[PDB]
Paper text:
The observation that Cys111 could act as reactive nucleophilic residue on [name] prompted us to design covalent binder 15 (hence afterward referred to as [name]), by replacing the allyl group in 14 with a more electrophilic chloroacetamido group. We chose 14 as scaffold ligand instead of 13 (hydrogen instead of fluorine at the para position) due to convenient availability of 3-(Boc-amino) benzylamine as reagent for the incorporation of the chloroacetamido group during the synthesis of [name]. The chloroacetamide moiety newly introduced in [name] covalently modified Cys111, as confirmed by protein X-ray crystallography and mass spectrometry experiments. A co-crystal structure of SBC2 preincubated with [name] for 2 h prior to crystallization revealed the formation of a covalent bond between the chloroacetamide group of [name] and Cys111. The binding mode for the remaining portion of the [name] molecule remained unchanged compared to the parental analogs. Only a 1:1 covalent [name]:[name] adduct was observed using intact mass analysis by electrospray protein mass spectrometry, and no reactivity was observed with a C111S mutant, consistent with high specificity of binding and modification site. Time-dependent reaction monitored by mass spectrometry showed that [name] covalently modified recombinant [name] protein to stoichiometric occupancy within 2 h at Cys111. The reversible binding affinity of [name] to SBC2 was determined by ITC to be Ki = 2.2 µM. To confirm that [name] blocks binding of the natural substrates of [name], we performed competition ITC experiments of GHR_pY595 peptide against SBC2 either unmodified or preincubated with equimolar amount of [name] for 2 h at room temperature. In the presence of [name], GHR was no longer able to bind to SBC2, nor to compete out the inhibitor, demonstrating covalent saturation of the [name] binding site by [name]. Covalent modification of the reactive Cys111 residue by [name] was confirmed by co-crystal structures, and intact ESI-MS spectra with recombinant protein and mutants.
Residue numbers in the entry:
A (entry chain B): 1 to 104
B (entry chain A): 30 to 135, 149 to 198
C (entry chain C): 16 to 45, 58 to 112
Amino acid sequence: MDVFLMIRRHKTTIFTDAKESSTVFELKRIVEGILKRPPDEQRLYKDDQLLDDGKTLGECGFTSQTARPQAPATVGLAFRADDTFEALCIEPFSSPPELPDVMK
Amino acid sequence: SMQAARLAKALRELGQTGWYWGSMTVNEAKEKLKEAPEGTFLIRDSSHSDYLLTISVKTSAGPTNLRIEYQDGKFRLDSIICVKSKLKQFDSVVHLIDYYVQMCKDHLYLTKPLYTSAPSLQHLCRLTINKCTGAIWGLPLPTRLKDYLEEYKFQV
Amino acid sequence: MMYVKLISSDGHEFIVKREHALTSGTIKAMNEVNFREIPSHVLSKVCMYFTYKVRYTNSSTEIPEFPIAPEIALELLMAANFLDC
Ligand SMILES: *CC(=O)Nc1cccc(CNC(=O)[C@H](Cc2ccc(OP(=O)(O)O)cc2)NC(=O)Cc2ccc(F)cc2)c1
């Protein structure tokens, strides 16, 4: 069961995929190879819920039907800051302009 | 005249749909549509030399098929079946399909096409824009992109 | 040669599989790319298109709908044309 994800921190968005049977830790290993911070310096979130390293992505609620290629599920990411973690902070994408009236 | 220049334009449009399956047989279309939602449809070549194309569509009772004829520069649903005088004629076969899809939204029931492959992102945007308006002329787009939209004005 | 970084006009960084980014002939012609005229509400959708296109090319899986909000469709059309995808 493939799950398609956006891992998001600040203004960084990683598009990647994994399996429902993948662990949260394995996701942190993907992030480590991209952003060069080790798993112990990462916190991953589904909405505001901290994810435990040992759980599978399916156990966290990431399912193939709700994490599709054309509509990936978001995983929040926060990094170590000194002796603690930064607060989770994901910056929104830009706002679309107003539709032409002909299109509304 | 068979108006081959018009036919070529219509077949180009058909090639852009992403839901034209070419040489597919009736049996192959049945297997493809067997478990699809009601109204799921595709277009393919017809086995019958008097017709150009066939619509294959899922009904509540299973897939069914309806041929399309091309005569004198016009496409029309099969008139051996449907009463001829009440059949609209079209210059474009994608227009024919789009017309019946839109009529079903407001006994051929068409909803959504079965794609052979993923369309280009440009085409997906074109579909979205067409579902919003037909007034290409006034969109805030460069002329190049208005011409692109004009090449395929259909909502399906 | 595993991921590439695509940066939107408003400074969002999208890190995507290089194989998937090559869906774009324009990206394929050119590790990081800056799109001075494509904002993040457009570029994020482009990146989902890459995932969808790779997944649903030469598959036996039924091809699902690719969702595009009317409000992004015009800029996304221009992006897709510029990107040749
Ligand atoms: C005006 C209107 O709405 N007419 C209309 C709509 C829906 C259905 C029909 C009647 N259709 C049939 O009787 C078809 C005839 C048919 C059979 C096979 C093809 O494919 P081709 O030879 O490759 O062009 C075209 C038309 N009968 C069926 O579809 C029955 C059927 C179903 C599944 C199969 F695998 C085989 C046959 C009129």
